[model samples]
Target: DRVFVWGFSFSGALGVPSFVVPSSGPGPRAGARPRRRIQPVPYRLELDQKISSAACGYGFTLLSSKTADVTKVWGMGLNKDSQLGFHGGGYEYVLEPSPVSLPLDRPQETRVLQVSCGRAHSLVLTDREGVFSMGNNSYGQCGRKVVENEIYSESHRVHRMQDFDGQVVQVACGQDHSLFLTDKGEVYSCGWGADGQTGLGHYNITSSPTKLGGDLAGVNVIQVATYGDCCLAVSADGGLFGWGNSEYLQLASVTDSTQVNVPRCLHFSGVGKVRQAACGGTGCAVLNGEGHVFVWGYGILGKGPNLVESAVPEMIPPTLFGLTEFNPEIQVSRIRCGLSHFAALTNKGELFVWGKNIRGCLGIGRLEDQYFPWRVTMPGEPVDVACGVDHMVTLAKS
Candidate 1:
């Protein structure tokens, strides 16, 4: 199985060649920098190893593999803040894929379970050694004890968060914040909290991991997500709690204020238990137990006819793009949202995309914006899908 990628390839985030051929003759514009290729369709990545999981940052991509009891990591694209996890021959950006070695004292048996990237930082979680982070520490999003202006160019173990009683099960990052979820369902937040994204009821920057209080204290959080400057937590009982900046769209149930200083339960008018939830720079989405998708926020919600933002959650009918058959059995299996676009994989091996098509992020082979769900063509059945700030990554089985 190989990884297929599309959308923005600038800074080499797509794991493919991004530069155009240079001119042969010398002229007024000769020897100028090559132009970048904005890929609009799914293309197989030229990697030899099978990728188990992957994550995307502002301008980079991280991939990992665990095939033969040995774990390996690779990265490409921007590294000005060391977001790539390793230096690229003294270059500011890594134009191609390169190996990233973890600074672990244990044996090779320690497998990397997951990895996440913020705008200018990166985080890695291991099955044995807990969590490790690197890159920009200006806001202490790395979960390490450092000055407000510190930056770790090399991967370092996050000692401050290691004092937890349980193992770290998952990790997530926003533009300047990070969230860590433990195996016992506890959440720890750090980094820039100017907008109350930490869910601690205050807007103070925290350099170390602090336990979230209020409505999230005793609740068992099953999943967590972050937008540009907001945070969300989904409880084990299918309860959605959100806080932080709601200027672009109201993330919580209340519409009286845009900034939710504390964690508040989000009530959906007519929806079942939310099985999965995702946040974007301008919108939010939730997948219910019935495989129904509910969206709100900016114009990317696919509500139809008019492009308007809504504070309330709106249900997207299953028959949007002639997807439902006579029996009306089509259901969504997975959904992902980016800064201005959305993608969903149906249970029948179909891929649907919509929203801002800037640089062709919608994967429909065109640069037109889609207000409704548009089915995209793929070579095989998609098993998983992921989106970055403006790019899309899909894992499929041929």
Candidate 2:
């Protein structure tokens, strides 16, 4: 399989230290920034490796791993805080794909089921047990005690978070916050809660994993997703719930306070058994087991220029993709949410991309803002897609 990447380039505001390298390459200065242009068209990432899953961070870090085999990983982009799982000989942005050591270690955990990348930190869910993390702890996103210049998080790693329910089965990261879902029905999050993304009902930086209380207390969360500022959770009952910055009506309403300290279910969606609930910067999207798509909130709702902010989720009809029957194989099997766009993959393995279309993110050449280019076809039958703040990467059969 091969990987295809597009969208904008790197530019961050984190305070990471920088140094120079002798032969390999020189890491950028701590503060100097660049306005590099990204590929406006789909370009293949010529790595002959089979990538099972991928995750992108706020800045310049992409975790593309070999999950079908052992938990092997390769990182591309900036490695300022050892974010690439390696100290790149003091190099800053390592353009080529660099290898990452899982468990980074004296072997014990074998396979990584999933990966979550925060602003500058990375989290992994392994087969052995608990979750593991590395890099940038300024906001305690590493899931450990806050430390500065500690180099490696192994000094104080984020584990099974003892004070919660069953073993952690998944890990989700938002800018500076981290969320965990246990085998049981509990949800926990820690780190950057300044705007209340933590769901712990407060506006302080929570250093340790804290259970999400309030209205989300009794719900059995099946999946959770976050791309930074906002949070979205899907319950076993296919219920839609969210919290965090609502300045843009992300939670389907601008009438309430933007900071939703606690989790509140949006019983409005009226969907059933949701397969996934993707959280974007200013909105949320749902893909039920039936493969139907629903969207809500501000900024590029994929309904064309007339699209306006709404606190209620609206369904996009199947005819948009030319689907006229109930064949599960022809339905959307996966949905990916982005800052102002979305990607949907069908069971038959076809891709449909649309939305704000910023910087030619839709992979269309020359670049024009496509409010509703309708159903743009993306040919591929692959395992995963990684959508970042301004770019995207998809792996498909070579």
Candidate 3:
């Protein structure tokens, strides 16, 4: 197994050379010359072991691998706020993948089940412990209390949530907020809520995790996702809800409302039960049980060229990408959304991508934007895909 990554590499977040020319006469310079730009192609990671899972922050990446005895975590890119899980002595960036220490109190036999990254914070879930978070807490996104301008360089146990009685099953992070979903279908939110992205009913900065009230209090949320300043949740009954910043992107159902303080259900004319959902920089997407993908908001939505935004969920025509004609059995199983791009994995093990292609985030070996879904050529079967603010990571079976 191997990992492939592309897109923005300004801070070595892609785990490959950024190809930027460095300043020779600067105070400190090494490696290749600094050249800030996007990677036009997918590059394989140098790790020898298979990556079990991966997550990305604003300008960093977190990868995890499991051996027979213990699970190991690796990170790369910006460490300015210790978001990478470790403090880099003098250099602000890590040019290569490095080991990240976790605050596991269990023995070496413990296993890590999941990892998540926010703009400047990180979260880890283990088989034994509930959840642990670290990095920047400026807005309480880390789910803990720290000095006003301080950050947790090491992992810290996230405080007990208000109404979460069961184990945490999933975690999602936005630019300055974090969401946690419990196995009992409860949702807790923390961090900056000035724009009402926290879904806590008001614009307030919460240092501790608070159970969401209002309409969401009665819903059994099964899936949670957030990007930029918006949050989304999918109920067990197949209902989709959205809130937070909808200003110019129309993330919520109401187009005129700039901010939604509480969760609001979104109705799609013909869309079926939503199995999964994701949010990008200025857009949002949902995958139905029938394997259909619906997209809305800013940027390309796999509709066509010249269209930049949509206020309602639009079905990407199957003819646009020759989907049904070429492979009728291919049903999308998973989808990953970046700041302005999207990648989808089909049941046939094929990868389809679209949206902003600047710096080659589309993984089409070009810098042009893809308005419609385009098949990405890969040597192996893609098992999982993860998207960052401006980069993409794919785990494939060799």
Candidate 4:
């Protein structure tokens, strides 16, 4: 289905179903509108294809799909800060879906493999880990220098990460920061770190990538995870490390609620090999090779705390209680967490979801919450799943 206009689901505009307007030419014919009708704004359609994967933020959405040339890109919603890649300066909020222009003059030559949207900025990582960022940079999340004390200024244009030419193998975005994992198992971070979410160890806020130091120097980092205030790195040896903010146990505290100023290796003795990890704005979840899942962090968001936010990592009690339930049928391949909900996908293509569903994020198509895990049908056969603050997406077979 071709999606068109999109809006935030706030108190005033909660039930607006996304719809597309039939285009007859280059622009939406200028016309007046009645108060009741929210005019169908003009959105640019650059290619003829169907969307396959999509991720939504509070006010913007990123879509990717198959294309005869390469891959198609589409975005809609807010652009006050150039989140929509509009040409020129000044603020102009996009009212309909449109194609984001690449720095390359020829659109046909630009190919994007994957895209991720944070609170206000969006990240597009090429197959070779070439990163491009655009949107709000107030927090230096765009990996650019912070604004100096200048007398006068006009354009504080958000930057493109590709300009740095850093080979980022994996990318993860926090509420105000962004994490990039290199192919050599190294980690670099940029943006807000007031709470130490940047893994720079109590360092001042950085507008560029900062490497995480510690015993993780040579370990091949298989995955990188971050929440509202903290971050986690899982190594090929199954060792997991966390740093940043843990005030609410959102990042599996190894200490009190104080901010983890630097990268701290989390000890998970005898848990076997850690396979996958996922986090949200408030909590984190980890899955081991034994088919067991462990959760830690903020208890306020429904994640129970074993102790008063210990600066140590603890194992989540097995639901089936016995090791017999930890069989091949239940091996978890990937995990995702929302602000209040958590979900996981097994190797067998089964989907299990739990936690808050204030906006039908649980996929039950209704408003309800679940404490224990429940089975849900995936939109298709998924190889992986990702959940934003509230919305979710599955990378499945087409």
lDDT on C-alpha atoms for all candidate structures: 0.75, 0.69, 0.77, 0.60
Query: C-alpha displacement of 380 in model 3, angstroms?
Result: 1.3
TM-score of 4: 0.76
Tens digits of per-residue lDDT for model 1, 82-133? 8777653667667667877677666467777777787988787787777777
Off by over 4 Å in 4: 1-54, 65-71, 87-97, 105-110, 148-158, 162-166, 250-253, 299-328
Worst 10 residues of 1 by lDDT: 17-26
lDDT of candidate model 4 versus the reference: 0.60
Better of 1 and 2 by TM-score: 1
TM-score of each: 0.90, 0.83, 0.90, 0.76
Instruction: For model 1, state the Cα shift of residue 62 in Å.
Output: 0.9
Please list the residue runs of candidate 3 whose C-alpha ends up more than 4 Å from where it truly belongs after superposition.
Answer: 17-37, 66-71, 151-163, 249-252
Candidate 2: TM-score? 0.83
Across 279-398, the per-residue lDDT of candidate 3 in tens digits comes to 887888888888888888887877887667877888876554346655776678897787778878888788889988756667788778888898887677889888886777889988
Q: Per-residue alpha-carbon lDDT of model 2 for 264-337, expressed as tens digits?
A: 87766366667698887787788887888887778777677687677777777666655766752467778887
**Candidate 3: residue 216 Cα off by (Å):** 1.9
Q: Could you tell me how far off, in angstroms, the CA of residue 105 lies in candidate 3 after the best superposition?
A: 1.1
- Candidate 4: worst-modelled 10 consecutive residues by lDDT: 6-15
Backbone clashes in model 1, listed as residue pairs: none
Best-fitting candidate, scored by lDDT? 3
**What is the full ranking by TM-score, best candidate first?**
1, 3, 2, 4
